[PDB]
Design a protein around this ligand. Structure first.
Ligand SMILES: *CC(=O)Nc1cc2c(cc1Cl)OCO2
Lengths: 179, 235
């Protein structure tokens, strides 16, 4: 089967490690959630096409500007992650992550992924954000950002509840297949 | 990888690796701390196993089955013998610390109380200097190693045969040549993540909290120098 490469980028604690773990295991880890993700090669069948999707994370690389780009060679799709409970992580998308992803991966499709969508109705999250004069990322703010950065699309998921996780990785496979 | 160690790290966590009657005699904070220490060792064991696939399966296989220039093999797997010695020694020390902590009559029940001392030795002095120079060299030759691999795969029919043949086993699904090189470059950036989470559950003994805080500062210092020493070479 055809082999495609995926790299997930985004600020630290934007849920990117959790997202890769929950998809590569097919559930939220009941006993222990690992701290790190090594790599994974998923066998995905999307729209009748069989693909080998190699998964890679950039967690731990966020402060090392010369090490981090070594993750980019031959990437076919980028999941550009942000957390819906962290409006500040969305502000770092167009001026930090997008210029870098477009410089090292020109023509590579980017999916803007809003993680932790379950925290949109979490009372503790809304209270913590209200103290810092903020609120959880509204769905139209994510769509407006994806539109502004020329992303292939906008998607939302929750690694805690597993809602939307399968759709994100099937869509990333379709985006990687387009040439 | 040896069967004894593979079985010892087969479970998803420390709570699943030990007998349930042993787990139930411990405080939740000890279970949580041990879960991250077990992940550090389990991922170090997988890392040493990635380096053994590079040296014995890929590198040695090319020397014994192909008529490639040994300079081409060196370009494909830079500093792998050096990396293998550093991490095999570190893994050896971690595994002996686990064996020392084993409950008599058991080969699986253990609680590691000291780890910081071992991490300070690894990430300080001559030991850290050798890792910094080795990783600065490996990461500067990383892109050239991928380009050399891709050229050999697209021009040499015998190299393609060799690759298709050795990577055929299921156990090697995510351990092809390029996957092994990226797994190795990414290893060093996992240590602060693993040590910070271990530290978060090591406030019981104060000497341990300090030793883990020193080890954390030493790893970040190593990453900073490795990152400063990188200068990507070209094919
Ligand atoms: C010291 C020790 O760990 N003993 C031990 C041995 C076994 C089980 C529990 C304990 Cl606490 O279960 C089977 O073997």
């Amino acid at each position: 089967a055809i082999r495609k490469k995926l790299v997930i980028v985004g600020d630290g604690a934007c849920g990117k490690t959790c997202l890769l773990i929950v998809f590569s295991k097919d559930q939220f880890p009941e006993v222990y959630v690992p701290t790190v993700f090594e790599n994974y090669v998923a066998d995905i069948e999307v729209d009748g096409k069989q693909v080998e999707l190699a998964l890679w994370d950039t967690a731990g690389q966020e402060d090392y500007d010369r090490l981090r780009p070594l993750s980019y060679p031959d990437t076919d799709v980028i999941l550009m992650c942000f957390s819906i409970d962290s409006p500040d992580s969305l502000e770092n998308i167009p001026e930090k992550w997008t210029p870098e992803v477009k410089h090292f991966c020109p023509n590579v499709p980017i999916i803007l992924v809003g993680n932790k969508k379950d925290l949109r109705n979490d009372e503790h999250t809304r209270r913590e954000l209200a103290k810092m004069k903020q609120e959880p990322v509204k769905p139209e703010e994510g769509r407006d950002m994806a539109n502004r950065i020329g992303a292939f699309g906008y998607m939302e998921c929750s690694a805690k509840t597993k809602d939307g996780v399968r759709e994100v990785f099937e869509m990333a496979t379709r985006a990687a297949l387009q040439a | 990888s040896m069967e004894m160690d593979e079985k010892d790290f087969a479970a998803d966590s420390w709570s699943l690796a030990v007998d349930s009657s042993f787990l139930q005699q411990h405080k939740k904070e000890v279970m949580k701390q041990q879960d991250v220490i077990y992940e550090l060792i389990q991922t170090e064991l997988h890392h040493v196993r990635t380096l053994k696939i590079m040296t014995r399966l890929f590198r040695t296989g090319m020397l014994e089955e192909l008529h490639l220039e040994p300079g081409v093999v060196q370009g494909l797997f830079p500093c792998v013998d050096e990396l293998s010695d550093i991490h095999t020694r570190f893994l050896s020390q971690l595994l002996e610390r686990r064996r020392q902590a084993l409950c008599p009559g058991s080969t699986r029940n253990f609680v590691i109380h000291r780890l910081g001392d071992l991490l300070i030795s690894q990430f300080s002095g001559p030991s850290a200097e050798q890792m910094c120079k080795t990783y600065s060299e490996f990461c500067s030759r990383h892109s050239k190693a991928l380009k050399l691999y891709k050229e050999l795969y697209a021009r040499d029919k015998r190299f393609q045969q060799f690759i298709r043949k050795v990577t055929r086993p299921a156990v090697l699904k995510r351990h092809g040549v390029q996957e092994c090189i990226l797994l190795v470059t990414q290893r060093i950036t996992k240590y602060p993540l693993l040590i910070s989470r271990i530290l978060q559950h090591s406030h019981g003994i104060e000497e341990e909290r300090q030793d883990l805080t020193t080890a954390l500062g030493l790893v970040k210092e190593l990453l900073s120098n490795v990152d400063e020493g990188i200068y990507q070479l070209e094919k």
